[PDB]
Symmetry: C5
Subunit: 307 residues, 5 copies
């Protein structure tokens, strides 16, 4: 089979959609193979830029369309180039911008550690007609962490494997295995904006909700706890307008639920404290001394559910 | 008529729009039919990739354009392939990304059980010229439930039928019935994010609204009930900024209305309790003992309207 | 002139933009005319699918480009078909998805009764070269009301008329009148989501604002009225984040303004009641008995401004 | 030089972006010039619709590409037509939808009076090869004010001028001046939605903020002023979610700042009134009589800053 | 090598995306080189407008595709022109609208001083085949500051350099260095909208939060501080709905965190003041005199963290 060497350059990885489970990758792909020799004008290799390639495909020149398995729709190919050396080898250099899918589990949202995967495969030619020799992925486009939503860690893990298709065994006798390239670029989400802007205000608001037990009146405690509940419902907005709309719950959503439950349990506790009286003569001194026990128990529960 | 076998592979189903009643489907479609034999170069089948197909259509090769009935606009076809065997049969393999419509009733929104429907039909050839033999839908792209907005349940129900067009009987004598393929993939919406983030806070807020009757002052009760009403109007935002903008009401919207009515009825009850006095000497003890009757009656009403 | 019969099928009408005054229409258009006879292969009519039509236009075949007058930009034509019978008549079947404009008065917003208008006209040929014979609009795509933002009422009103262009009389002597088709599909907006989610909460909030007069303290009444004013400003969000951004006022906006004025007038009334005292010894009993007169007068004013 | 007469029809002007300083214009453009005579089939003028024009451009027919100077990107040309009379004159009729830029000062936002400008120029031919004779702009697409975001006032001011390019004097000896058409359509923004929905609630809220001085307690006055400050911060949302995101301040933003300053100054005034006591025996009677002086002074300041 | 002179005109720079770190640039690019002489019709230079250029590329005319290194996807090229003089030199004039990337550190967000960078490079020809002679960037499209999100300061810094590619040394012996043009246009963000609408209200709200110490009651101080905390959580929305969603923290976000900490520290201080009593007989006079020390210390801390 024709041996094709792929070299993929990643200019950037942006546009991470979480409900769509996609991400936008821009870059270049170079596919170099060999064939029959040809007579170029002079000894120099011949350059066939975009458009003019299709004239050569009409003439009978073999250029395989290496598709992306995990891309969503047709990628926006920009300029494509075909370099034809006189000795017989062809280089196909195409610039792409595509929207690619992955698994992308987004639990532990501010501290996400995921990988962006590019799966390249010939659209038509199996391992008996086209075979990928090696891939080098030059993702040199990695930089500082200070201005980076995602920090790319390490290099890109490249794998060349063979995928066996079950449906093609009906139409093909025994040649139905396609050469596939999997490229995995591991990234870690930047948590500092979420840690400073969403976690610490939640801690401050939940502690201020704990502080309702330091009032010396029952009706003041209920009205204060309702003001605190109104404060919580509002934080939910702030986050839900900014955090991604993934289809499950995260650490921040769970802390929101925990603050809801804290305020509701405080309301139940102060109502039970006021109406524990058998004849309305006993005060609220003993169980109202949960000023430093209820926050401790709630923090223990939170430590349980986080880990 | 020419017998065409279709095989549709669904890579993903995403982009569910509820006010538009559409959803985005990516995948492949393979249409295999038979015809007159041809002489390929060698005994090998011939591959005609994208673009080069239209040269063969210019030459006179028959490739039918199988359109999608329920698609919205023109689908974004990526790479298309034409495999021509020497024995005479043709395979047309096209990758599509389209936006498809359905009925999509979205009442009972967090517990939706809908189906995504692909309707394939020849654009031009009726059952006297083209007939679909069988379709197998390989929606193997189904996975866990833990990170899945929609859980695909079961396989894809495939139907091949004939649709009779009334307008074509004027232009065609008696050949006006088109072979249509209907593919239905049944999915169930993931409710856990909506159950934990939108239903349980509504229950906690409505219970805190019930707790206004445990105050011992009338003016405190009114000011507290107005703080509770302000808390409710805010929850409406949180949801309406996040939940889809379908054109009717759902379980969460109905619970919002129920909380509104609960607070308004509590305001009416406490005003009626304070101004039940004939001369301003009688207290509020009897009808203010709806602390455990008004929540019970409201829960009974909610149980009626849910089922 | 060449007589063309049009048949327009409306698959759906969606994407109603109110500040843009547009709406998205998907469907098919069939234009059937007659001409000189031709020799098809066999006695069968010939099918020229997309792309291949332009080869026939290069050859000299007459296909007129029937444009949409009220479309915004170029419509997304999908598959187009040309059926050429041997007897001499041509059928042009094109699938379109376009964004069309209209007048679209959106006053009385939740109870809107508008019409969606398609205006078809030849781009080049006046009534002396092309004339529309008849149009039948098969908008059979109408269904239940339970899951329908807009309920299509009745059939589609079709009109074939002649439009006289003033600018073309300079370049054409007396042949400057173009055959135009106007198709009007009357629809009524579904009001139940707006009635239950936006009108009834406004009524409950405005009634709760009326209830400020049942307090027995002046400072309590002012602080309560300011809490009510804060509750109103918030409802404005809920709606303005969800309701369309048309450039005027609607019933819901007018009710918002009415609630604003109600709270402001209540503030003025209670301040005037407290400071009506000549020497600070007289109470607030007489004009504070507007508990059941101020809501009645406000309801009378609202009944005046609604009708 | 070849004399070209332009006639521009404006179907609509929509899509006004304020941070982008663009607006979307749909319409038609007709360019009529004269040339060498040709033999049409018969005495009738010949119609070359879209696509088929490029065959004639390949043949050697002169059609100049009149570009838009202020357009952003390539305009979405729909159908284009070429009318070739036998006497020798050519008409090029193209339908465009483009996004055009202007200066667009958006200070005094609800009462904006701007102009939408179309600048047409040959892409290649200077005044020695192409010259615009006259332009008539038929913007008959103007209508009522009741449902119109922008009211077009008057006609469209048309100017034909010559623009001298400094860079072209290096590559061209003395022929570097291009014929440019400037079309200015003056429009006035509809203010009634902003006046009723954003200005009047601001006036009511600021007056309610003035009313804090009618309380008879200091702590009540501070807590009330903080409730009023919380009410103001919320109005900021309502507007900033709805008003355009231009990069400066407007009348509504300035009124928001004025209400902020009013509440802050009221807080300072009541704190200074309570702590003006030398030994805590003197009441707050004199400077607390700014109930009708502080609003008057603030209204005078607002009248100064508005004009 | 062939010497190419580039001249880039920037019509506008808009569409600054901060989480994407891109910006949209519209303009023209002129590439003028020399070659073999040709016989034009007459002594006049020949104009080949869009489309017709590709016929000349098919004929064998050398037009290099100068790509943008930092562009995201394929730029929206509008009209392109090819001017061929008889003496032998070629001018390629193309209008582009592209989305370009840069580093774009957005710390100190309202007072950003960044640069917009265009990197032009031949897609195929190294410095042994194509060399850029000089670039002049005519960014005359700079204007007032009063209506300008970004103020362009100075001219555009232009650099012509050579970039050595490491991967090309395997396929090319010693000719692997590409001529690159870097154009940097320095801009400063307009801060006045953010300064008046987001910084000054934050200062007023934080000062009003300082004013909680002037109350004379402990329970009043806690309930007031919780109202102030609810006021802060709301300001977070206003900003986060309007400010860009960059992945770190800015001056406004840090001021939000500082106000959060101020209110939390005030709550801790007043609780510690009330419960400093050994037997409940001592008042809160000494440490409650942090009315003018706690704001001063917080302002000192803010002055430390700003610089």
């Amino acid at each position: 089979p024709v041996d094709v060497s792929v070299s993929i350059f990643i200019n950037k990885i942006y546009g991470v959609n979480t409900l769509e489970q996609t991400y936008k990758v821009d870059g270049y792909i170079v596919a170099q193979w060999t064939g029959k020799p040809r007579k170029t004008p002079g000894d120099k290799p011949l350059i066939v830029e975009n458009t003019q390639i299709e004239r050569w495909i009409n003439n009978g020149l073999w250029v395989p369309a290496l598709e992306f398995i995990n891309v969503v729709g047709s990628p926006d190919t920009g300029n494509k180039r075909l370099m034809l050396f006189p000795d017989g080898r062809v280089i196909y250099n195409a610039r792409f911008l595509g929207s690619f899918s992955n698994d992308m589990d987004f639990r532990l949202f501010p501290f996400d550690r995921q990988q962006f995967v590019l799966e390249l495969e010939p659209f038509s030619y199996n391992n008996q007609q086209l075979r990928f020799s090696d891939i080098q992925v030059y993702t040199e486009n990695i930089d500082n962490e200070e201005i980076d939503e995602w920090w790319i860690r390490g290099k890109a893990s490249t794998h060349i494997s063979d995928i066996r298709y079950d449906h093609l065994s009906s139409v093909q006798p025994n040649q139905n295995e396609f050469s596939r390239i999997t490229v995995r670029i591991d990234a870690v989400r930047n948590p500092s904006y979420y840690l400073w802007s969403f976690i610490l205000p939640l801690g401050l608001i939940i502690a201020a909700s704990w502080s309702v037990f330091w009032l010396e009146s029952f009706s003041e405690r209920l009205q204060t706890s309702f003001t605190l509940m109104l404060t919580v419902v509002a934080y939910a907005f702030y986050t839900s307008n900014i955090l991604p709309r993934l289809p499950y719950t995260t650490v921040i959503d769970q802390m929101i639920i925990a603050g809801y439950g804290s305020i509701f349990a405080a309301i139940l506790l102060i109502i039970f404290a006021h109406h524990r009286q058998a004849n309305g003569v006993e005060d609220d001194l003993l169980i109202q001394r949960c000023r430093l026990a209820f926050p401790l128990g709630f923090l223990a529960i939170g430590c349980v559910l986080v880990i």
